[PDB]
Amino acid sequence: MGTFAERYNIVCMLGKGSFGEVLKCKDRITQQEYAVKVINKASAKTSTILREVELLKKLDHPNIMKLFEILEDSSSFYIVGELYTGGELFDEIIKRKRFSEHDAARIIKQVFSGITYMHKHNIVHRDLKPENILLESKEKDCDIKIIDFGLSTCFQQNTKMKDRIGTAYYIAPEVLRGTYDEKCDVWSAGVILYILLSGTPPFYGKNEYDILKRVETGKYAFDLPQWRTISDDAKDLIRKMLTFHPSLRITATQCLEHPWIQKYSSETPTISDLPSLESAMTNIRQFQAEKKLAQAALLYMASKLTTLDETKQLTEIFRKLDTNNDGMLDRDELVRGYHEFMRLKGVDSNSLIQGSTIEDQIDSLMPLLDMDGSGSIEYSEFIASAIDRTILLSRERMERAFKMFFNEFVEMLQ
Ligand SMILES: Nc1ncnc2c1ncn2[C@@H]1O[C@H](COP(=O)(O)O)[C@@H](O)[C@H]1O
Numbered sequence: 001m002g003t004f005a006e007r008y009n010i011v012c013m014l015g016k017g018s019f020g021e022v023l024k025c026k027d028r029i030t031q032q033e034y035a036v037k038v039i040n041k042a043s044a045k046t047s048t049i050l051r052e053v054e055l056l057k058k059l060d061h062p063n064i065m066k067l068f069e070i071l072e073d074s075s076s077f078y079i080v081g082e083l084y085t086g087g088e089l090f091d092e093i094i095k096r097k098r099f100s101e102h103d104a105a106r107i108i109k110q111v112f113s114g115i116t117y118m119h120k121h122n123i124v125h126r127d128l129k130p131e132n133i134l135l136e137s138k139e140k141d142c143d144i145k146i147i148d149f150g151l152s153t154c155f156q157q158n159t160k161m162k163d164r165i166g167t168a169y170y171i172a173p174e175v176l177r178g179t180y181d182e183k184c185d186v187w188s189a190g191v192i193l194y195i196l197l198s199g200t201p202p203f204y205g206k207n208e209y210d211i212l213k214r215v216e217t218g219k220y221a222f223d224l225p226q227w228r229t230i231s232d233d234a235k236d237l238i239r240k241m242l243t244f245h246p247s248l249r250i251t252a253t254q255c256l257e258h259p260w261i262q263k264y265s266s267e268t269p270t271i272s273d274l275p276s277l278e279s280a281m282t283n284i285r286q287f288q289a290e291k292k293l294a295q296a297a298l299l300y301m302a303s304k305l306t307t308l309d310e311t312k313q314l315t316e317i318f319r320k321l322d323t324n325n326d327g328m329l330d331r332d333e334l335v336r337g338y339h340e341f342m343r344l345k346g347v348d349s350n351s352l353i354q355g356s357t358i359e360d361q362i363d364s365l366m367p368l369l370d371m372d373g374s375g376s377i378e379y380s381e382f383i384a385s386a387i388d389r390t391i392l393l394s395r396e397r398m399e400r401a402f403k404m405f406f407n408e409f410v411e412m413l414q
Pocket residue numbers: 014015016017018019020022035065081082083084085088131132134147148149
């Protein structure tokens with residue numbers, strides 16, 4: 001475990017939910033701010049708790065809440081995560097009341113990418129709804145972040161503190177029968193998508209009694225007038241997600257790959273991205289030239305101590321390279337991105353041999369950037385190798401890296 005009070009100062013409260021309370025805290029050395037969920041230990045239901053929390057920490061996906069550490073004192077567990085300032089997707093729906101097909105697809109693609117990644121890691125959300133999706137900031141096209149999952153097996157929730165009425169719109173019919181498989185998240189995501197495009201829940205009613213009665217029948221329609229102005233492709237995706245029988249309901253990956261999603265997720269590099277692509281390429285080569293000790297040390301600092309404001313350019317590059325929208329870079333995506341980079345420069349990729357091809361270059365690189373051997377370059381691995389090492393050289397950040405384990409320490413990093 002570890003000592004929370006030594007490392008962090010509590011600044012203010014941010015919210016209260018089912019499992020505990022969420023506060024803003026500040027790292028005493030770096031002054032970097034974080035969100036911390038504080039859970040009373042008597043609420044447990046600590047060895048297996050830390051084991052399941054460890055899996056949560058290693059989730060590394062741009063649309064999933066990022067957790068940095070779990071600390072403990074005599075009364076509480078502290079789960080310290082990235083701080084998001086844009087509020088709940090719920091509030092954005094209220095303000096806009098509904099979204100263009102282009103805007104809805106961009107939002108729901110991120111939900112699909114996050115849920116796919118969760119399911120591949122054997123995690124079911126079980127309460128997916130707009131109140132549990134935060135915007136990372138107030139910036140226009142910012143990433144959304146799925147929150148509020150993973151603790152239901154280890155800790156006792158207070159049913160009162162959860163917004164039951166809100167949840168009811170979103171629950172799959174099999175949940176009313178005691179079932180919580182992966183497919184229930186797909187149904188909830190389909191309710192979200194229905195709402196993004198129409199502004200209205202597909203299963204609706206005055207109060208919770210009428211809503212749940214409609215959920216149990218599974219019956220919904222595209223009868224509202226605004227559905228006449230919405231494409232058949234979007235309706236086809238919704239019909240596949242809101243299938244009554246979970247066995248016939250499509251998977252999250254099939255959601256992510258649906259043609260309607262692909263049409264509006266064509267982000268690809270352009271001439272204006274060349275400065276940052278060139279920046280990323282130089283830093284990656286330097287990273288791939290440093291020894292296994294330096295590399296693992298750099299990954300640790302980039303993934304835990306960098307800020308959203310410092311990774312924003314690299315996050316846009318990552319998204320443009322991520323052709324299949326799953327929030328990870330596979331071998332072919334790096335090869336294609338390399339080819340696109342050269343094309344944008346006006347350079348024939350065959351000039352490289354005069355001393356190997358893009359394909360040989362990437363295949364030699366994959367074992368060095370995929371430090372965890374996952375088969376793909378996750379977000380934190382890309383940032384660590386592509387970030388300018390200069391920003392990681394902050395004295396405060398070195399101080400924090402040291403304290404987690406000095407004059408010699410600083411030189412070794414340098
Ligand atoms: N990472 C975060 N950044 C900012 N606010 C958060 C974060 N996590 C939770 N919150 C706030 O705390 C509330 C309850 O959190 P939760 O119990 O995880 O649903 C959320 O609805 C947000 O208002």
